[PDB]
Design a protein around this nucleic acid. Structure first.
Ligand code: MG
Ligand code: MG
Ligand code: MG
Ligand code: MG
Ligand code: MG
Ligand code: MG
Ligand code: MG
Ligand code: MG
Ligand code: MG
Ligand code: MG
Ligand code: MG
Ligand code: MG
Ligand code: MG
Ligand code: MG
Ligand code: MG
Ligand code: ZN
Ligand code: ZN
Lengths: 269, 114, 92, 100, 222
RNA sequence: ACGGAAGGGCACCACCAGGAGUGGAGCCUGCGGCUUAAUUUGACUCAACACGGGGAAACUCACCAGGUCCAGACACAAUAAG
RNA sequence: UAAUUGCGAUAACGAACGAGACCUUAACCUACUAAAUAGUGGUGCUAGCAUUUGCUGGUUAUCCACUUCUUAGAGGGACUAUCGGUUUCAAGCCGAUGGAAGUUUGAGGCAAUAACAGGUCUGUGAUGCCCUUAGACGUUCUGGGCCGCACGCGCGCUACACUGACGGAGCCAGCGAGUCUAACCUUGGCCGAGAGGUCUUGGUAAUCUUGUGAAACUCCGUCGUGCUGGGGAUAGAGCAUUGUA
C-alpha cells in the first residue's frame, strides 16, 4: 500500500562472492485507471427501514423491515435519482433486494413499463423469476414474462410484461430489431447482474449491448438510467466511465467485509 | 449558518454530518457542510433534527453488526492473513525477546536434568 | 567549551532517531532551526565525533549536512542508555 | 466556475505538447473552452565582466533565460475539473490552476 | 506567494544546489548528473549513477539518508520528497563518469600517458564519434605544462557543440599540486533521437529506383 | 624571426575626404609623486590608469592606534568531587 | 572570394580542425491557431455643439463580432531572383528590373593548432610549499584611513553663446524593474516654496506604478553682442531625507 521508491531486481551467484548485479526499476506510469476506487464504511448508523418509504403498497410486503446494512451509500440514492451509478456487491449480500430497486427507481414515476433484467447464465433466469412469482405479482398486480431461447411467448404478453429477464445472447437477437421492433421503446432503466464476465466468452455479448443503448440515448436525446450488479472489481474507474456514471453514487467494497467471514488456505503439489 | 450553498455531495467529497448522517424521509446523505448551514433536507425539505423494550428490537439488534462491519472494515488489515503450510509464525510481538537467548536455557538445564 | 550537559544530551539524542542533522555555517546566529540552542555548539560539537570517527561532514555551500556512520550508532546508545535496537535511524 | 490554468515553463517545445493535449481534452468532452494565450516571453538578462581579476580588455558577457508563459481558461462544473490537474505533469513545466 | 520571475530562478538554483551536493557525496559511486521533476505536492529527483545498489543500499539505506538529508535541509514536509536511483546507460560515453575514472587512475600511480590514453580508447569503443581528454599542470616537472590526448574528430564552432559534445571537469589532488581534468565527448549523432539527428552541414540523398522505358503504348484494363 | 628588400592583397584598433573631438579652463574619478600612525593593495605601450565589476562614513577592510575571544578538532600525560 | 572560399593545374590521394553552415535578434506576411492580463467596430446607458444624417466622448459583468494594429506558437519568405555586359567564357565580377530585404540582408553568440615564463593565490571549503597560530598575520568591538595636497599624467562631465539663455505653453519613445513573513514598485486624497511629509490604493505583475505624458525637440514671449540674463567651482547661512551615527 505505501508505494516503494522502486522495484529492484537482484542477481547473485551461488559459488563466488560479489557476483551480483542490480537494476532499479522505476514505476511512474501510474494513471487514474491504475487504482482501486473502493469505499470506506462510513457512519450510517440510522437506517430508513420500511417506515420511511411513503408507499403502503410495498410496506405491506417484504416482512424484513430493517434496511440492508451493506447499502450504506446506496440506500435511497437511486430510489429517487435518475443518475447512472455502479453497485458492486460481493457475494449474496442483497443481490435480490438491490436488483429490485428498478421498481423503486422510476416505476412509481411512470408505471406499466417493461424494464428489462439481464442475467449472465440461463440458470439465473429461473431463480430470478420463480422466486418472484409469490413476492411481486400477487401484491403489485404486475406480470413477468421470461424471454429465453426455449421460450417464445406471445409478443402482446411481452409488451404488457412488467419485468423481462433475458440472457445477452437471447437479448442480442431481439436487439437486432431496434429499428422496427415496436416492443423496444419503453427502455428507461436496464439492470443486469454479474457484469464482470467480460473476461469470459459471454462478456463480449453483454458488453456490446450497453454501447448500443448509449447510441440510442445519444441519438434519441433522452437519458436511459443504467444499474450494474456485480462483485468487487479491480478496475472500478474504467468501467464506471464506460457506463456513464457520475460522482454521486458508487459501490465498491472489498472481500474484507462479508455477511459471513471467509477463511482461506493455500497448498502446493 | 444560513448559507444557501446546498452541498448535496452525499459525503462523496466531504465528511458526513455525524449527528445527521442522512435524511429520515428520502434517504439523501447530508454531509457536514449541508448540516450546519441548514437543518432541512435539500431534496424533500424534511427536518433532520427534531426541536430497550420501548425501542424496536430489530433496530438496535441491526446496528450491532454494523459496528462489527465497521470493526470488520477497521480491522481488515490482518483479515487477509494466510495460514499456509510454510508460514513460520514466529509469534513474536516485535522482537525475539530482545534478541537474547535465555528463555530456552532452562530447556538445556532440563536436558541436563534428564 | 564549557556549556551545559542539557543540550549535548539533547543534540545527540536528537541525532539518534532520524540520523541526520543540518546546521548552517552561520557563526553566532544563535538560533538553530528546530533546535532552540545556538548553532555555535551544533556546528562544532560534531566534528569532535567525526574527529573520533563517528559522523561525516559536508560543506555543500556552507550548510554542514551531518550523518552518523555505521559504528556511530551504538556509541550514542550507552550515551543515552537506551536498550539495544530501541529506535535507530535505520528504520524502514 | 471559471477555471483558470497557468503554465510557465522555461522550455517551450514540451510546453506546447502539454498545452496541445489540454485544448483537445476539453473539446473531446464537449466543454466550453477559452483558448491558450501566449504572454510575451520573459527574457532574464544578466551582464557581467568576463574576467575574474580586474585586468584585460573590457570584455562583457550577457546571459539570457527565456521564461515562456502560457495559460488556458476553462469553465466547467467541479466534477470534471479535479480530473485535469492530477494528470499531464511533465518535467520543467509547472502547472497552476485557480478557481473563480 | 513567489513571482515566477523569482520562483523558477529559485527553482534552477535548487537543482544546482543538489548537483554539487552529490558529486561531493557519491562521487565514487559514479554520479552522472541529475534532473529535478516537479509534481503538485510531489517533488521527485532522479539520481544517475553506475552502482545503483550502492546508491540504494540495504534496506534502501543510502537513499533513505540522502532523502532524509534533503528532507531536513530544505524544510520539506515529510513524504514530499522522493529520490530515484537509476543506472547510467552507456557508462563508456558519459563525460561526467569518464572524468571520475581519470581522477581514479591518476591517484593510483598510473601513468598520465597510459591512464588517459586508456579512457579515450574505451570512450570511442562505447560509441563516440570523437573524444579527447585534457590534463594540465605539473607533469614530471615543476614547470607547468599541459598535454592533450585526442582521437576521432571534434567541432569547436557552432551551437552543435552544445548539442553534440558534453563537458566534464574534475580537479585532482596530488602532492605535486593540482592537476586539472577537462573532458569533451562527442556522442554519435545517429543515436541523438531528441531534436537533431546529424550535423547541420550533413546533406544526404536517398537513392532512387531506375526504370527501363516501356517503349510501347500498353493497355491494362480492369 | 627580422629587412630604411621585391610581388600580390587587406585593416578608420591605418591613412585619404571629412565630421565630432580630446590635449587649453572648472570639477568628478583613477595612476605616479609628496605626506602621515596608516594614508592597504594588483596591474605600467598596443595588451593599466570611471580597470579589480573598487560609486570605501560603521561594515565592506586587506591598513593605523587601541580593547574583548578562541572556534587548540582529536590523542596522550599531569591537577583533581576535602 | 572576406575566407587554404572556389575554378583549375598537379607527386600526390584521401582525410581532419578553422571559414561557412549553425543558432539568438531585427525588419515581410491583412495567411493557420487563438486572446477583456491587447485592441478594433457595432450595439445598450450617458455628456457637449449644430442639431438634420455628424464630431468628440464616458461607461464593466450592457452585450455581439474581428484579429488590421499587439502577442506568440506553428509556417512561408532570399537562393543574389530575372535581364544585359565581361572572364580559360571557371570560379566570379559589374549594371538594370522586381522584391521588405540583393555591401555572406544588418547586429551578435559561437569560434582552431602553438604560445605569453601576460592577469588572478584580493572569488573559490581549488590547491603544492613557506610564515604564524593564543598579549596569533585567526576571529570580533570603538575610532581613524583608504578621500590626506608643492605638482605631473588618463578615462571623462560642464561650458565659452543669438543654431544662444530664460518664462510660458504644444507635447512624443523604447530596452527594463518592482512585497510574506516582508515590508518592495507606489496611484489618489491632503499638508508643504521646495526638499519632502501623512491617510489610503492596486500590483508576486501583458491587467498597478506607467501612455513611465523624459529630455533634446516645436511655437509664443523676455534679453541683446556688454565676460551680459553666458558659465556656475568657489564660500556662507538655513530647511528635509537616508541611516545608530
Ligand atoms: Mg573601413
Ligand atoms: Mg585624416
Ligand atoms: Mg568636446
Ligand atoms: Mg591588438
Ligand atoms: Mg569599523
Ligand atoms: Mg572602514
Ligand atoms: Mg455609452
Ligand atoms: Mg547573368
Ligand atoms: Mg555575420
Ligand atoms: Mg583569481
Ligand atoms: Mg580607493
Ligand atoms: Mg578603460
Ligand atoms: Mg524655451
Ligand atoms: Mg511605452
Ligand atoms: Mg546663466
Ligand atoms: Zn458536502
Ligand atoms: Zn429528504
Amino acid at each position: 500500500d505505501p508505494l516503494p521508491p522502486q522495484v529492484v531486481v537482484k542477481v547473485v551467484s551461488d559459488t563466488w562472492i560479489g557476483c551480483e548485479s542490480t537494476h532499479a526499476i522505476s514505476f511512474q506510469h501510474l494513471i487514474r485507471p491504475f487504482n482501486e476506487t473502493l469505499q470506506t464504511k462510513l457512519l450510517k448508523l440510522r437506517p430508513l427501514p420500511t417506515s420511511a418509504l411513503q408507499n403502503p403498497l410495498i410496506e405491506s410486503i417484504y416482512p424484513f423491515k430493517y434496511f440492508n446494512p451493506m447499502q450504506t451509500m446506496t440506500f435511497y440514492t437511486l430510489y429517487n435519482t435518475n443518475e447512472n451509478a455502479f453497485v458492486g456487491s460481493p457475494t449474496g449480500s442483497g443481490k435480490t433486494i438491490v436488483a429490485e430497486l428498478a421498481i423503486w427507481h422510476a416505476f412509481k414515476t411512470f408505471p406499466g413499463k417493461k424494464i428489462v433484467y439481464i442475467a449472465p447464465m440461463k440458470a439465473l433466469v429461473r431463480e430470478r423469476v420463480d422466486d418472484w412469482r409469490k413476492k411481486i405479482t400477487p401484491v403489485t398486480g404486475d406480470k413477468v414474462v421470461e424471454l429465453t431461447g426455449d421460450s417464445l411467448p406471445d409478443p402482446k404478453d411481452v409488451h404488457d410484461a412488467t419485468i423481462v429477464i433475458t440472457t445477452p445472447e437471447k437479448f442480442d437477437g431481439i436487439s437486432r430489431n431496434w429499428q422496427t421492433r415496436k416492443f423496444v421503446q419503453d427502455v428507461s432503466l436496464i439492470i443486469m447482474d454479474e457484469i464482470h464476465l467480460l473476461a469470459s466468452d459471454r462478456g463480449p455479448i453483454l458488453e456490446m449491448i450497453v454501447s448500443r443503448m448509449n447510441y440510442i440515448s445519444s441519438q434519441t436525446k433522452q437519458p436511459v438510467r443504467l444499474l450494474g450488479m456485480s462483485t468487487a472489481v479491480s478496475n472500478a474507474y474504467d468501467m464506471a466511465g464506460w457506463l456513464g456514471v457520475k460522482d454521486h453514487g458508487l459501490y465498491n467494497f472489498p472481500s474484507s467485509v462479508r455477511p459471513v467471514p471467509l477463511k482461506m488456505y493455500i497448498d502446493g503439489f | 449558518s444560513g448559507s444557501s450553498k446546498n452541498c448535496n455531495c452525499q459525503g462523496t467529497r466531504h465528511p458526513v454530518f455525524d449527528i445527521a448522517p442522512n435524511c429520515l424521509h428520502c434517504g439523501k446523505v447530508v454531509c457536514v457542510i449541508e448540516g450546519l448551514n441548514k437543518g432541512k433536507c435539500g431534496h424533500c425539505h424534511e427536518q433532520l433534527i427534531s426541536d430497550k423494550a420501548e425501542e424496536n428490537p430489530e433496530l438496535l439488534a441491526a446496528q450491532e453488526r454494523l459496528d462489527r462491519l465497521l470493526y470488520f472494515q477497521d480491522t481488515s488489515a490482518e483479515r487477509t492473513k494466510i495460514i499456509d503450510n510454510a508460514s513460520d509464525f514466529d509469534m513474536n510481538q516485535e522482537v525475539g525477546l530482545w534478541g537474547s537467548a535465555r528463555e530456552r536455557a532452562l530447556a538445556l538445564k532440563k536436558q541436563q536434568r534428564n | 567549551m564549557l556549556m551545559p550537559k542539557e543540550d549535548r544530551n539533547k543534540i545527540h539524542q536528537y541525532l539518534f532517531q532520524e540520523g541526520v542533522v543540518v546546521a548552517k555555517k552561520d557563526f553566532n546566529q544563535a538560533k538553530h532551526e528546530e533546535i532552540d540552542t545556538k548553532n555555535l555548539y551544533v556546528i562544532k560539537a560534531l566534528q569532535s565525533l567525526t574527529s573520533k570517527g563517528y559522523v561525516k561532514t559536508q560543506f555543500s555551500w556552507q550548510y554542514y549536512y551531518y550523518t552518523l556512520t555505521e559504528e556511530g550508532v551504538e556509541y550514542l546508545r550507552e550515551y543515552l542508555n537506551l536498550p539495544e535496537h530501541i529506535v535507530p535511524g535505520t528504520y524502514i | 466556475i471559471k477555471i483558470r490554468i497557468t503554465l510557465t515553463s522555461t522550455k517551450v517545445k514540451q510546453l506546447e505538447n502539454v498545452s496541445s493535449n489540454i485544448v483537445k481534452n476539453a473539446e473531446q468532452h464537449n466543454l466550453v473552452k477559452k483558448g491558450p494565450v501566449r504572454l510575451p516571453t520573459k527574457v532574464l538578462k544578466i551582464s557581467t565582466r568576463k574576467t575574474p581579476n580586474g585586468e584585460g580588455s573590457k570584455t562583457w558577457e550577457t546571459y539570457e533565460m527565456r521564461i515562456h508563459k502560457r495559460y488556458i481558461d476553462l469553465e466547467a462544473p467541479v466534477q470534471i475539473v479535479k480530473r485535469i490537474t492530477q494528470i499531464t505533469i511533465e518535467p520543467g513545466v509547472d502547472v497552476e490552476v485557480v478557481v473563480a | 506567494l513567489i513571482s515566477k520571475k523569482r520562483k523558477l530562478v529559485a527553482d534552477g538554483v535548487f537543482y544546482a544546489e543538489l548537483n554539487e551536493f552529490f558529486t561531493r557525496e557519491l562521487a565514487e559511486e559514479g554520479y552522472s548528473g541529475v534532473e529535478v521533476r516537479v509534481t503538485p505536492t510531489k517533488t521527485e529527483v532522479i539520481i544517475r549513477a553506475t552502482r545503483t545498489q550502492d546508491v540504494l543500499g540495504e534496506n534502501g539505506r543510502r537513499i533513505n539518508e540522502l532523502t532524509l538529508l534533503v528532507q531536513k535541509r530544505f524544510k520539506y514536509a515529510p513524504g514530499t520528497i522522493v529520490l530515484y536511483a537509476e543506472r547510467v546507460q552507456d557508462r563508456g560515453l558519459s563525460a561526467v563518469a569518464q572524468a571520475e575514472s581519470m581522477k581514479f587512475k591518476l591517484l593510483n600511480g598510473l601513468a598520465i600517458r597510459r591512464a588517459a590514453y586508456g579512457v579515450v580508447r574505451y570512450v570511442m569503443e562505447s560509441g563516440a564519434k570523437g573524444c579527447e581528454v585534457v590534463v594540465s599542470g605539473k607533469l614530471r616537472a615543476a614547470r607547468a605544462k599541459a598535454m592533450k590526448f585526442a582521437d576521432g574528430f571534434l567541432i569547436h564552432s557552432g551551437q552543435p557543440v552544445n548539442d553534440f559534445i558534453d563537458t566534464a571537469t574534475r580537479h585532482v589532488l596530488m602532492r605535486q599540486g593540482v592537476l586539472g581534468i577537462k573532458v569533451k565527448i562527442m556522442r554519435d549523432p545517429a543515436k541523438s533521437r531528441t531534436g537533431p539527428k546529424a550535423l547541420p552541414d550533413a546533406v544526404t540523398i536517398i537513392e532512387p529506383k531506375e526504370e527501363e522505358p516501356i517503349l510501347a503504348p500498353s493497355v491494362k484494363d480492369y
